[PDB]
Design a protein around this ligand. Structure first.
Ligand SMILES: [Ca+2]
Ligand SMILES: [Ca+2]
Ligand SMILES: [Zn+2]
Length: 1276
């Protein structure tokens, strides 16, 4: 297998395994370096990498080499022989750790055997030229102090110690005359600057580094993985597939944008995971073709190679077979070398998608960062990698014997502190952006905290090019993944040809391009007066000296005053925090403010269901002020209106090209060769859909999801700053006390911090679910739909491209031309559903997606709501809403459609929303209030159906209509067949709960059933299996339509459409959510009001009402009069009878638990409704007298709501006073006794109390009342 050699730095030179090498970049001028052969073709030079740097660059200065790295400098690392030996031994241990596993051993093998082609682009096809700096490197055989003799050798990898920045490991290829053999199929000598002790630190905002705001967070990297990551780069460069292509370039137009270097796809491929997804499928192929093209040139070179002038010793045939093995070329029974497409795809996918930091980390059970695009914390120093107590060849730091395996605990900074030491910041250099106000007042910001947003130029416009379709044309796809299991069990991948002699002729042509580096300014000062997220987080910090601080809700005050710390929590929380108390109450206050912190923090779990938003973190706007000034006004409201988009610091300009046109080829007389050109144009069409989605996905990840990542972090920093500030205040107050006082103070700083930490972790989980949801929200509604638009345009242009073609082939297509005609129309009849897991297999991304799709609220494609005297669509799809003057609207979300021509609403749906995924799957919900028939017009009521909401496209669509006491749903397939379901309430009931009363309607449609729900209960079901296609995304017209009587009107509310069938459970919950209110309601369902005339109704005694007895001060219970007229089709009990009551306030709208005075009119006077007080009887008549302080009777009343389910009923209860839980009784009706038919009265009663507590709540109780005002919808 793979043998790892052992040596000691001081071992003698032998010119074989221990040499004095002359590195490629020394150009063969001056001293050499002692090098050790760790394995075949791989060398170790335990010294600082100085090629291209200046001695001073090794010292820490006010400069930096890389902008997005927290650089560590130490010019003393490797400055002694013992340091050099340690480096050597550590490299040996790391290589042993790499091969301890099959996967890593293979990596080493491919690399060892992936010898560089002998030559590069400049070399003639017929020759092998080893005399090039990328192939041969010299070793000094000559005695000490002289270069009398230099011998050449072939090598694959040369690993040096670090360059100026210890933690900046890098793999370098050799460029000669501006070209790179390692990027053009040849391969060449690879170099690496590497440091094993100073490893990077990372952590997940989603996860929780042992969860502790006060304890160190993050994980440190296993250097073996870091080395394998560099070895992958090395592998690519050896196989010469390290090609350059369209890079991911950061947008740097805005001050808040992260500045960084261009990122090649080879870099993201190397990391693996979700990163390859940032590289569009278009570019994945561009790189694929390039590599394949480089290989083509190589295989041709093998078929032509004849001699080697540079080294007479080279055995042509020996090498031809070694390279054939290296590139997996095929040899026919002729000696002809060929590229077997299948074996090429395998090798390519193995090298680009098999060997990735992510796949290796997983196999080795090593933890690593979530993405190349994730915050880079400060590095740490591993105490001693050579100490098996700390680091083993088999497990790294995650040693199970030390119970350090479970959960990568061994890499956990807070857990395995005996493994590392922190680093002296005085020696750290970091690129900072200084943001100055032009007043001024500057804030230093790490370039890591900025928003990384990919520029539009990063993406491939290739989708706009034309496609030549032939009977041959085929589908092109590249799976950005590769089963790691088979790569490990893959036999014929391994080298099957021995490694040739590494000894060759000396290199005399030292021509080579040596990279020159120079530090760049570590701080760039820019001018801005914007007070965005940076400024906001800043206002939450305080100087290390200032010890007496106080919180403040004023951002500006906090900026100016150093002892003032901004807080985005409640005014209450803030005042309590600045509160100063006596030592004897300090404990109680600490306990209060802490528990309060937790409460405030946990408001991150707020629900906004009524607004169709399950989760909202209301304080994010106040905390960061990111996006469109989210710290002003009410964030919840603003979000309900604009959604995720408001949180984005910048709205990216997407690249969504017009998909180029297809040019079909003619194959006259050849029926088949013509059919294929159709079937193929179809499949190539599917390719364009998928490729467009990938283009969207790649953009979503690098321009949008990056910003939301930045917001999640910002919020983590924000919660910490708040906890830190609180503790600072708490500690400051405590130390004001005397030691004698402190002694008698009950304080546990480990309880405090624990609770504060527990509150943050919970908030972080909410914030993360919320932000991820927003991210996915933006993708699905603000990005995908736009791609769908173009894709349909194309799908269309292509439809009339194939039809024409079929036309011109009528003669050749004969008796089937008409058959394909359909083939084309039907194949293009369904749009490809977007599925994220097609472009990524990342676990987190997939879960974000599956979760978003599991929330029913995300299927809402229409949600008409009120906003500034007008209706608008808040589904996020931007439906067009045209409301005409005839429509009445109010802020209670109700709108009225009259008989007027101008009372209508026009909705133009979004054409890009997947709806007719074929099989019919959707629902519609809304609240409606339909007035009672005109007693003198019942004939036109019963007969005569008028449409209220119409939605048709080319004579097909759906319709909601009404025929009196019946609401109707109607479907019309693309042909003309029609099926309908309906609900119909009765018009002969004494008291109807539908007529003129608000009620919930939901209509759902799945493959074979259209159902109608009323208040969450199923009322009717219609089998609609027949029905063919049904166009439904046409315009929706809200207008009363048909033979309608001028006085006809309809109230509607909360109109919503879902692109899916709602379950009975969803419906019932929507019913409950939309029924909830803090105010009570009247008989009709409207908000209950104070100072409003109302007749009373009793849910228990339907036909009973209240009349003030001619004699005494009590309320009789007469019987409701009734339909006196003579129509046998209608009947009811007069509602506007009995006393005319009016609700009065105690201490506008009538809310629960409110205290009131139930008065009522009597001629001109306004009397009240009192109780006795001492009725030692369970129940007894109430007292209706004028407005006097009859201290003999109770007056005040507390209206309540005991029913947990929706209802327009309310209760009226008396209390000893607005304080004493001591109750008196609830208002109702009870029959007593009187014989010359007894007599029921306005009986109050305690018997109720026990009853109300009953579940399910009792609807028919006598304490259940309802208020009825004259309404135009009800005439008697
Ligand atoms: Ca990709
Ligand atoms: Ca301050
Ligand atoms: Zn890399």
């Amino acid at each position: 297998p793979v043998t790892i050699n052992n040596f000691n730095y001081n071992d003698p030179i032998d010119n074989n395994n221990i040499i004095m090498m002359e590195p490629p970049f020394a150009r063969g001028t001056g001293r050499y370096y002692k090098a050790f052969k760790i394995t075949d073709r791989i060398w170790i030079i335990p010294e600082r990498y100085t090629f291209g740097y200046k001695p001073e660059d090794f010292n820490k200065s006010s400069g930096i080499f890389n902008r997005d790295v927290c650089e560590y400098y130490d010019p003393d690392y490797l400055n002694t022989n013992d340091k050099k030996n340690i480096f050597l031994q550590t490299m040996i241990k790391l290589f042993n750790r790499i091969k301890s596993k099959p996967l890593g051993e293979k990596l080493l093998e491919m690399i060892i055997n992936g010898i560089p082609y002998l030559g590069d682009r400049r070399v003639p096809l017929e020759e092998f030229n080893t005399n090039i700096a990328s192939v041969t490197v010299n070793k000094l055989i000559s005695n000490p102090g002289e270069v009398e003799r230099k011998k050449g050798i072939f090598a694959n990898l040369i690993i040096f110690g670090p360059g100026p920045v210890l933690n900046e490991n890098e793999t370098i290829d050799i460029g000669i005359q501006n070209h790179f053999a390692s990027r053009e199929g040849f391969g060449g000598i690879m170099q690496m600057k590497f440091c094993p002790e100073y490893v990077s630190v990372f952590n997940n905002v989603q996860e929780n580094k042992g969860a502790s705001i006060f304890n160190r967070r993050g994980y440190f990297s296993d250097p073996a993985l870091i080395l394998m990551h560099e070895l992958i780069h090395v592998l690519h460069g050896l196989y010469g597939i390290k090609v350059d292509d369209l890079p991911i370039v950061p947008n740097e137009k805005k001050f808040f944008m992260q500045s960084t270097d261009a990122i090649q796809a080879e870099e993201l491929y190397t990391f693996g995971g979700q990163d390859p997804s940032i590289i569009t499928p278009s570019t994945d192929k561009s790189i694929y073709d390039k590599v394949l093209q480089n290989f083509r040139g190589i295989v041709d070179r093998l078929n032509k190679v004849l001699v080697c002038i540079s080294d007479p010793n080279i055995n042509i045939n020996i090498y031809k077979n070694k390279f054939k093995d290296k590139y997996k070329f095929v040899e026919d029974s002729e000696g002809k070398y060929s590229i077997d497409v299948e074996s090429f795809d395998k090798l390519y996918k193995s090298l680009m998608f098999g060997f990735t930091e992510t796949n290796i980390a997983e196999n080795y059970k090593i933890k690593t960062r979530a993405s190349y695009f994730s915050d880079s914390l400060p590095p740490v120093k591993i105490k001693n990698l050579l100490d098996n107590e700390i680091y083993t060849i088999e497990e790294g730091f995650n040693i199970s014997d030390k119970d350090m395996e479970k959960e990568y605990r061994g890499q956990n900074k807070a857990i395995n502190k005996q493994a590392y030491e922190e680093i002296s910041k005085e020696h750290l250099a970091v690129y900072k952006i200084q943001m100055c106000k032009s007043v001024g007042i500057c804030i230093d910001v790490d370039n890591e905290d900025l928003f990384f947003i990919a520029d539009k130029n990063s993406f491939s416009d290739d989708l706009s090019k034309n496609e030549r379709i032939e009977y041959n044309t085929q589908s092109n796809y590249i799976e950005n993944d590769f089963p790691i299991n088979e790569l490990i069990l893959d036999t014929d991948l391994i080298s099957k040809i021995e490694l040739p002699s590494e000894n060759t002729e000396s290199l005399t042509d030292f021509n080579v391009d040596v990279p020159v580096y120079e530090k760049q300014p570590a701080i760039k000062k820019i001018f801005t007066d914007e007070n965005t997220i940076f400024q906001y987080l800043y206002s939450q910090t305080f100087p290390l000296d200032i010890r007496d601080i106080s919180l403040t809700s004023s951002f500006d005050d906090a900026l100016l005053f150093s002892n003032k710390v901004y807080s985005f929590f409640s005014m209450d929380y803030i005042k309590t925090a600045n509160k100063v108390v006596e030592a004897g109450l300090f404990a109680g206050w600490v306990k209060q403010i802490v528990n309060d912190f937790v409460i405030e923090a946990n408001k991150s779990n707020t629900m906004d269901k009524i607004a169709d938003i399950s989760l909202i973190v209301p304080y994010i706007g106040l905390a960061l002020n990111v996006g469109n000034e989210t710290a002003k006004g009410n964030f919840e409201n603003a979000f309900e209106i604009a959604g995720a988009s408001i949180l984005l610091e910048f709205i990216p300009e997407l690249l969504i090209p017009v998909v180029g046109a297809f040019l079909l080829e003619s194959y006259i007389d050849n029926k088949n060769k013509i059919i294929k050109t159709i079937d193929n144009a179809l499949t190539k069409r599917n390719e364009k859909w998928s490729d467009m989605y990938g283009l969207i996905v790649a953009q979503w990840l690098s321009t949008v999801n990056t910003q939301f990542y930045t917001i999640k972090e910002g919020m983590y920093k924000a919660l910490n700053y708040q906890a830190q500030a609180l503790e600072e205040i708490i500690k400051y107050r405590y130390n004001i006390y005397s030691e004698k006082e402190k002694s008698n103070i009950n304080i546990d700083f480990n309880d405090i911090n624990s609770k504060l930490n527990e509150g943050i972790n919970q908030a972080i989980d909410n914030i993360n679910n919320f932000i991820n949801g927003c991210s996915v929200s933006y993708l699905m509604k603000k990005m995908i739909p736009l791609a769908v638009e173009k894709l349909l345009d194309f799908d269309n242009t292509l439809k009339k491209n194939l039809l024409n073609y079929i036309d011109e082939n009528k003669l050749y297509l004969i008796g089937s031309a008409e058959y394909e005609k359909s083939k084309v129309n039907k194949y293009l009849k369904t749009i490809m559903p977007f599925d994220l897991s097609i472009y990524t297999n990342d676990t987190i991304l997939i879960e974000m997606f599956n979760k978003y799709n599991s929330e029913i609220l995300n299927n809402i494609i229409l949600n008409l709501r009120y906003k500034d005297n007008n209706l608008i669509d808040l589904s996020g799809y931007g439906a067009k809403v045209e409301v005409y003057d005839g429509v009445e609207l109010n802020d209670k979300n109700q709108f009225k459609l009259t008989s007027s021509a101008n009372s209508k609403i026009r909705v133009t749906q979004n054409q890009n929303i997947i709806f007719n995924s074929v099989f019919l799957d959707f629902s519609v919900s809304f609240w409606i209030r339909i007035p009672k028939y005109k007693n003198d017009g019942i004939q036109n009521y019963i007969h005569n159906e008028y449409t209220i909401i119409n939605c048709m496209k080319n004579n097909s669509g759906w319709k909601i209509s009404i025929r009196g006491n019946r609401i109707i749903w109607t479907l019309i397939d693309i042909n003309g067949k029609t099926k309908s379901v309906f609900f119909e309430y009765n018009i002969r009931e004494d008291i109807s709960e539908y007529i003129n009363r608000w009620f919930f309607v939901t209509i759902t449609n799945n493959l074979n059933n259209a159902k109608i729900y009323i208040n969450g209960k199923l009322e009717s079901n219609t089998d609609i299996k027949d029905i063919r296609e049904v166009i439904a995304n046409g315009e929706i017209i809200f207008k009363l339509d048909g033979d309608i009587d001028r006085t006809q009107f309809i109230w509607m509310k909360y109109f919503s459409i879902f692109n899916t069938e709602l379950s009975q459970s969803n419906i019932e919950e929507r019913y409950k959510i939309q029924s909830y209110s803090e105010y009570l309601k009247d008989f009709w369902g409207n908000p209950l009001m104070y100072n409003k005339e109302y007749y009373m109704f009793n849910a228990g005694n339907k036909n009973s009402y209240i009349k003030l007895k001619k004699d005494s001060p009590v309320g009789e219970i007469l019987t409701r009069s009734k339909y006196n007229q003579n129509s046998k089709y209608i009947n009811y009990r007069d509602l506007y009878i009995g006393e005319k009551f009016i609700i009065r306030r105690k201490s506008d709208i009538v809310r629960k638990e409110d205290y009131i005075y139930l008065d009522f009119f009597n001629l001109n006077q306004e009397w009240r409704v009192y109780t006795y007080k001492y009725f030692k009887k369970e129940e007894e008549k109430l007292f209706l007298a004028p407005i006097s302080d009859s201290d003999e009777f109770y007056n005040t009343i507390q209206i309540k709501e005991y029913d947990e389910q929706p209802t327009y009923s309310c209760q009226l209860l008396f209390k000893k006073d607005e304080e004493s839980t001591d109750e008196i009784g609830l208002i109702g009706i009870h029959r007593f006794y009187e014989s010359g038919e007894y007599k029921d009265y306005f009986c109050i009663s305690k018997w109720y109390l026990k009853e109300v507590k009953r579940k399910p709540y009792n609807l028919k109780l006598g304490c259940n009342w309802q208020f009825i005002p004259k309404d135009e919808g009800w005439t008697e």
